[PDB]
């Protein structure tokens, strides 16, 4: 049993040990599954795939590796972090053999990047159940196609009863800029560039003129700038004050979505964009923000006080608001005949000179994702947050070997798991004179301490905690 | 005192020595500034920051380091150039102690990439005042927020009374393609690819048919091509002849802008695009061109002959026109019931297989900019022109040390500043038979010589000089 965090200089080493229980899935069978087997009639929801007797270990969320204090200690004192190494151990096998193999060639479908439940519990005293491994493949409706694949995980050599080197990724930037993209200027000095201040002398006929003025401290909106904010794909704006929302169903009809092969997937969470404008936190994008859930909440149709809605507002300096248009583009040629016109731009892709911040990571949220293997990508960093990797922590597949032919003995296994990660850090060099914003607990008394068990012994994490507190210059 | 230029092989070394004067700013105080202290009502122009007693040296414009005869000698003979080293000196101090320090860790805000006035003068016999340092931080209206920063520059160690290495950047491309993106084809040969020439036989009912044809010299617009022009964000079209322009005020209302945290900002200069179509020199994008003032031009509401409007028409080979749509897309599925529908693309983001030319640099324009420190960016080359750098030449701060408590002695300083940049060159290898276009003075007689003093001794620059004269193949 090893649980503790070694804080040494520019690096951290976190260790987590948990106890688990592994059942027998599908009565040791592989089974084809599709929406026909499920019962869904929708095309957007159609799927075809296979369920397996194997389980797998998912440590892909931060709260697995970090206590609430280790997270507080990380996010207040550091400008960046990223994983280096991993050491997965499995021991104290107890059966009532066991096969385990890691997929290091990435030859199976990779399901660890989809943000599924089944992680090691955040509180070390919990005992967790290993989730079942399954995967999907190509489909026409619920039917398959000649290009679909079938994977027998028995055909992989497994050990009957390791260490990993993370590939180089950029530091996750756990900080919030203390400047904004449009305000980078010296407030005291004029630019040498000119802009077109006026197009007509006065009221009347035939008044056209061109008057130019100097861009300066008095009018900052018209100054020349070297860089522009990142891309936008607009989301619908929902208010947490329900009387301010429209009296109609618009959750799916009004949502932003993308379409692939005729199937419409919701755009979730989507591009990295600020959740809301300054001063309005009662609004949140429809699919824009990662929505967690409070302990003991329930699966379907929970109220708003039963969820934790995360906000990205810290990136409103470099990133456009998710519920607002990107800007305006001139839509015609003016002339003596026609007035100049401009149109709202809802979505804007990459232009040269754009800068943006990625989505924040949370104690509860995912760590890494797997970059798909394709001829192209742009900025592979994943959209739910975390570190994108072509060859990420391998999947660790485990099952119970059957003991008897469909007649077998009802049997399960249990044991211990330890995973240890080394995290490289980036220290805060700031010369800021006045004190930083920090993540702190509130002194005011309460029935229960936060991030702690209650009188029934149920651990819970009260609010989502972002990584962005310290500041940098833009 | 060193001023000269050494032309050696593929390198150029340009030394410049200027005399300066440093007053006492803010009565040695750090004074809060916002739009309230100015009185600005408008929301787009709201700001919050601080003004400091410190000055700074801005050599960031090309005419600091290049004489007109050195600049001609550069742009006629060379395809590309870029800085290598920097050597700065401050000497012959005359105080009527003086503190100076470079910010080599970039721990202060960086105000040099904003194209402010206050550069080392273009003509060496001038004496220049040193501009005041100030910086903006986060705001809500005129109020600050907890995330705003305060920087005391006394909290930086300074010398009381350096060399620099430029980071690797691409050559600025001084040339204009002698081919166009859409004409790269062989004019004598047919392609082996077919296009759809005819969808009907003739006028009548139920005439639908499909006829395919070889693409070749006869019809060149339909041929298949491997690349496409750069991205576009449309600008309004203003005319220097004012009788085409509309008799309405469209300077702010009709301009392309981008919005960040609820505040709109004019898109200036914006993505690099050709200024006007071939044959039309009288049009210019509303906010898409750099506009310089002529010598002695006032600050407010000058006419169109007092300013020098640069144009990008060299890049019309690989780039779309700023005042035109990028192209058409289909907006519907045709059928017997539904006719073909197309829309004109006003803004187009990056697509795979695009090519473009960046914006040109001028004798009067900026050299480098600082890339904002962010999780991501695309094509960091700055939009006003020049060399984008993550570690640009550091800021150099200077002030008079106060001699006395609010009661001090009125005191100012002066001295000499010598700056030396080592520029790397790329020679013109072209096999073109006929002679190039060059930059020339005009032999025709005039009252004064261009780029020289008048009878009152006032140095002035007659026209903006672009860098692109020599040609290349596409």
């Amino acid at each position: 049993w090893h649980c503790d965090s070694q804080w040494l200089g520019d690096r951290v080493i976190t260790t987590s040990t948990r106890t688990w229980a592994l059942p027998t899935y599908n009565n040791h069978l592989y089974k084809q599954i599709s929406n026909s087997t499920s019962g869904g009639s929708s095309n957007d929801n159609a799927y075809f795939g296979y369920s397996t007797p194997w389980g797998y270990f998912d440590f892909n969320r931060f709260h697995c590796h970090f206590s609430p204090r280790d997270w507080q200690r990380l996010i207040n004192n550091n400008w960046g972090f990223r994983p280096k190494r991993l050491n997965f151990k499995l021991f104290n096998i107890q059966v009532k053999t066991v096969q385990v193999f890691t997929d290091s060639d990435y030859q199976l479908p990779y399901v660890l990047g989809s943000a599924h439940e089944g992680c090691l519990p955040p509180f070390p005293a919990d005992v967790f159940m290993i989730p079942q491994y399954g995967y999907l493949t190509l489909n026409d409706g619920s039917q398959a196609v000649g290009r679909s694949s079938f994977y027998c995980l028995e055909y992989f050599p497994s050990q009957m009863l390791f260490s990993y080197e993370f590939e180089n990724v950029p530091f996750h930037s756990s900080y919030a800029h203390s400047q904004s993209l449009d305000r980078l200027m010296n407030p005291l000095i004029d630019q040498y560039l000119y802009y077109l201040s006026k197009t007509i002398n006065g009221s009347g006929q035939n008044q056209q003129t061109l008057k130019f003025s100097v861009a300066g401290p008095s009018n900052m909106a018209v100054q020349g700038r070297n860089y522009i904010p990142g891309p936008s794909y607009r989301q619908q704006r929902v208010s947490t004050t329900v009387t301010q929302n429209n009296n109609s169903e618009f959750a799916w009809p009004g949502a932003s979505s993308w379409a692939l092969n005729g199937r419409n997937s919701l755009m979730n969470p989507g591009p990295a964009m600020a959740s809301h404008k300054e001063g309005e936190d009662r609004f949140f994008p429809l699919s824009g923000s990662l929505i967690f859930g409070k302990q003991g909440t329930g699966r379907d149709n929970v109220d708003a006080d039963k969820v934790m809605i995360t906000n990205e507002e810290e990136i409103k300096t470099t990133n456009p608001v998710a519920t607002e248009s990107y800007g305006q583009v001139a839509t015609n040629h003016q002339s003596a005949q026609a007035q100049a016109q401009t149109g709202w731009v809802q979505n804007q892709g990459i232009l040269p000179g754009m800068v943006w911040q990625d989505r924040d990571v949370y104690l509860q949220g995912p760590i890494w994702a797997k970059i798909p293997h394709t001829d192209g990508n742009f900025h592979p960093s994943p959209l739910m947050g975390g570190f994108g990797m072509k060859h990420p922590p391998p999947q660790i597949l485990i099952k119970n070997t059957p003991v008897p032919l469909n007649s077998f003995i009802t049997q399960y296994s249990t044991g211990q798991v330890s995973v240890e990660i080394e995290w490289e850090l980036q220290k805060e060099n700031s010369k800021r004179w006045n004190p930083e914003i920090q993540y702190t607990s509130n002194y005011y008394k309460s029935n229960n301490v936060e991030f702690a068990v209650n009188t029934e012994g149920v651990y819970s994490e009260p609010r989502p905690i972002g990584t962005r507190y310290l500041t940098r210059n833009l | 005192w060193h001023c000269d230029s050494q032309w050696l092989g593929d390198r150029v070394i340009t030394t410049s020595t200027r005399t300066w004067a440093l007053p006492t700013y803010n009565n040695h105080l750090y004074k809060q500034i916002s739009n309230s202290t100015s009185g600005g009502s408008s929301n787009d122009n709201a700001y919050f920051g601080y003004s400091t007693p410190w000055g700074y040296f801005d050599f960031n414009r090309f005419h600091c380091h290049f004489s007109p005869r050195d600049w001609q000698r550069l742009i006629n003979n060379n395809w590309g150039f870029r800085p290598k080293r920097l050597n700065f000196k401050l000497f012959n101090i005359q105080v009527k102690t003086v503190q100076v320090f470079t910010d080599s860790d970039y721990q202060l805000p960086y105000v040099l990439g904003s194209a402010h006035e206050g550069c080392l003068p273009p003509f060496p016999a001038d004496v220049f005042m040193i501009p005041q340092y100030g910086y903006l931080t986060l705001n809500d209206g005129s109020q600050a927020v907890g995330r705003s920063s305060f920087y005391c520059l006394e909290y930086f160690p300074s010398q009381m009374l350096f060399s620099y290495e430029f980071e690797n950047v691409p050559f600025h491309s001084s040339y204009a393609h002698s081919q166009s993106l859409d004409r790269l084809m062989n004019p004598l040969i047919d392609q082996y690819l077919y296009y759809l020439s005819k969808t009907i036989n003739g006028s009548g009912q139920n005439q639908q048919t499909l006829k395919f044809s070889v693409a070749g010299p006869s019809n060149m617009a339909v041929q298949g091509r491997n690349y496409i022009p750069g991205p576009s964000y449309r600008q309004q079209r203003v005319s220097t002849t004012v009788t085409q322009n509309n008799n309405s005020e469209f300077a702010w209302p009709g301009a392309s802008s981008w919005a960040l945290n609820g505040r709109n900002s004019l898109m200036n200069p914006g993505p690099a695009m050709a200024s006007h179509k071939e044959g039309e020199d009288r049009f210019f994008p509303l906010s898409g061109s750099l506009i310089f003032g002529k010598q002695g031009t006032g600050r407010d509401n000058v006419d169109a002959d007092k300013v020098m409007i640069t144009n990008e028409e060299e890049i019309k080979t690989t780039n779309p026109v700023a005042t035109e749509s990028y192209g058409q897309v289909a907006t519907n599925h045709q059928s017997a019931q539904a006719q073909a529908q197309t829309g004109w693309v006003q803004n187009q983001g990056i697509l795979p297989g695009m090519v473009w030319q960046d914006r040109d640099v001028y004798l009067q324009g900026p050299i480098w900019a600082k890339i904002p420190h962010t999780d991501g960016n695309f094509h960091p080359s700055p939009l006003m022109g020049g060399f984008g750098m993550k570690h640009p030449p550091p800021q150099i701060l200077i002030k008079n040390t106060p001699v006395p408590l609010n009661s001090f002695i009125t005191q100012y300083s002066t001295g000499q500043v010598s700056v030396e940049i080592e520029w790397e060159l790329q020679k013109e290898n072209s096999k073109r038979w006929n002679p190039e276009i060059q930059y020339t003075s005009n032999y025709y007689k005039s009252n004064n010589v261009e780029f020289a003093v008048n009878t009152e001794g006032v140095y002035s620059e007659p026209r903006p000089i672009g860098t692109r004269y020599l040609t290349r193949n596409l």
Partner: antibody
Framework: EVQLVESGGGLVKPGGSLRLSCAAS????????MNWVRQAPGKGLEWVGR??????????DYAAPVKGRFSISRDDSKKMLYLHMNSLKTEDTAVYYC??????????????????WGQGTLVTVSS | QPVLTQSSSASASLGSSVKLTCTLS???????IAWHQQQPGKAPRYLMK???????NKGSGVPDRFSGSSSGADRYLTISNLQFEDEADYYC?????????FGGGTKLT
């Protein structure tokens, strides 16, 4: 495919008032300027008025004959164009067409270069 | 306010090209104009709009035998192949920010 239907036409005494309505389809009504034109029987087209888009302001323009008698209204939510007629004249009787603005209409950074006439509605003002 | 003038009526025999003139007022010369045809019993059909330069944007549903061109302050419409199916009032319209103006119509036969 853009479709424009009109309604509200019929018989009204020379003194009186009537409303016409135009329900747009297949076009982004919020982003487009609309127009009313009328054609007296056996006579050529004659323009009535326009209604600018919300972004450009909801202001409306009117032809010199019908100025001050008629109003144009729009209901973005219901995607309908309205023409309110008051103080009629015998000469007013025309087929009233609902037409989109000839320059075009630009929605979400895409422009459309072509014009779509309505179906038409006959209005006979007589007693 | 612009003033659109055009011929009262003009006809042509089948299989031949007919040209139709629409004259802009002076000082409105540069304005862009659009052509509409109206069948004797039907709602008008947008044909195309032509600039002073001679560049024109043809409709989506329109045959290729329609085309137009312009001299100074003088606009044209050319029906290159005449099919019995199109003979109708051809209206010329022009627009300004303040108002929209129509021609008096040209009946083709």
């Amino acid at each position: 495919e853009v479709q424009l239907v009109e309604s509200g036409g019929g018989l009204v005494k020379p003194g009186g008032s009537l409303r016409l309505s135009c329900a747009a389809s297949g076009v982004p009504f919020s982003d487009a300027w609309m127009n009313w034109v009328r054609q007296a029987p056996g006579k050529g087209l004659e323009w009535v008025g326009r209604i600018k888009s919300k972004k450009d302001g909801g202001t409306a323009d009117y032809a010199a004959p019908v100025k001050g008698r008629f109003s144009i209204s729009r209901d973005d939510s219901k995607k309908m164009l309205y023409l309110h007629m008051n103080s009629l004249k015998t000469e007013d009787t025309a087929v009233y067409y609902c037409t989109t603005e000839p320059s075009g209409y630009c929605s979400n950074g895409l422009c459309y270069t072509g014009n779509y006439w309505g179906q038409g509605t006959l209005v006979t003002v007589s007693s | 306010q612009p003033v659109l003038t055009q011929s009262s009526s003009a006809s042509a025999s089948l299989g031949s090209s007919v040209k139709l003139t629409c004259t802009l007022s002076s000082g409105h010369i540069t304005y862009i104009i659009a052509w509409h045809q109206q069948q004797p019993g039907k709602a008008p059909r947008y044909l195309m709009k032509l600039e002073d330069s001679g560049s024109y944007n043809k409709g989506s549903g329109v045959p290729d035998r329609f085309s137009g061109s312009s001299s100074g302050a003088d606009r044209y419409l050319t029906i290159s192949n005449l099919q019995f199916e199109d003979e109708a009032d051809y209206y010329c319209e022009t627009w300004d920010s303040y108002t929209r103006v129509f021609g008096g119509g040209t009946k083709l036969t």
